[PDB]
Amino acid sequence: SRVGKKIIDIPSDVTVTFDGNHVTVKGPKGELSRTLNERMTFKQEENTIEVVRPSDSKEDRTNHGTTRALLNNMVQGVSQGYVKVLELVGVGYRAQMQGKDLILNVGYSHPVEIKAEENITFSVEKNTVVKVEGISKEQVGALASNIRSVRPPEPYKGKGIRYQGEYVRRKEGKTG
């Protein structure tokens, strides 16, 4: 597992500490703690960490790769954070902030409220660019996915909520 073998670089401002399996990483933006695979060992250097698997079994290789990826994601989340940006397409499709919550008006007969969660921040720009910012990559993905699934893009005019870089397949709606 190349991903497992690869070493995680710790920025000077980030501190990683292990309690058996459970690990916690603190940094400028917050703290992230989770339980990693119990059969994986960690070589904790002053400026870097390495993940070690006991064997070359299928399960060991898979868990090695995923553990390395998860720990690296924790480190980068505390360091820089993660952001996902959605944009609204369609006349009248708008978003705005009701304090911390996000209210969307996308062609429904009612507005849709998405309640903010811990460690997550919503930001609306130009009424049509929503962005979710957080420390947890998983949480950012989940909340952005909920926002997009409120009304995903349709193919005949592209209207709806999309990830800003997303490619939306387009179809020719009307023919004689």
Partner RNA sequence: UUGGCACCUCGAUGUCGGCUCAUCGCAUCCUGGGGCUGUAGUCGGUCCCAAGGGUUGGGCUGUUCGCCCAUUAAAGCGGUACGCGAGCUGGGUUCAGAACGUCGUGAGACAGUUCGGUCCCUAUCCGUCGUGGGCGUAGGAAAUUUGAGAGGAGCUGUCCUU
Partner RNA sequence: GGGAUAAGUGCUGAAAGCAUCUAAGCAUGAAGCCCCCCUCAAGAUGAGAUUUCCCAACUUCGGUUAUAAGAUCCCUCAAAG
Residues of the shown chain interacting with RNA in the complex, contacts defined by CB under 7 A: 1-4, 37, 58-59, 61-66, 69-70, 73, 109, 137-138, 141-142, 145, 149, 155-156, 171, 173-174
Compute the least distance from the CB of residue 118 to RNA, in Å: 13
Dihedral sign for Cα atoms in the order 71, 77, 79, 85: positive
Other CB atoms within 10 Å distance of the CB of residue 82: 19
Between 37 and 96, whose beta carbon lies closer to RNA?
A: 37
Between 99 and 173, whose beta carbon lies closer to RNA?
A: 173
Between 46 and 118, whose beta carbon lies closer to RNA?
A: 118
Between 12 and 109, whose beta carbon lies closer to RNA?
A: 109
Compute the least distance from the CB of residue 2 to RNA, in Å: 4
Compute the least distance from the CB of residue 69 to RNA, in Å: 3
Between 59 and 125, whose beta carbon lies closer to RNA?
A: 59
Compute the least distance from the CB of residue 34 to RNA, in Å: 8
Compute the least distance from the CB of residue 129 to RNA, in Å: 18
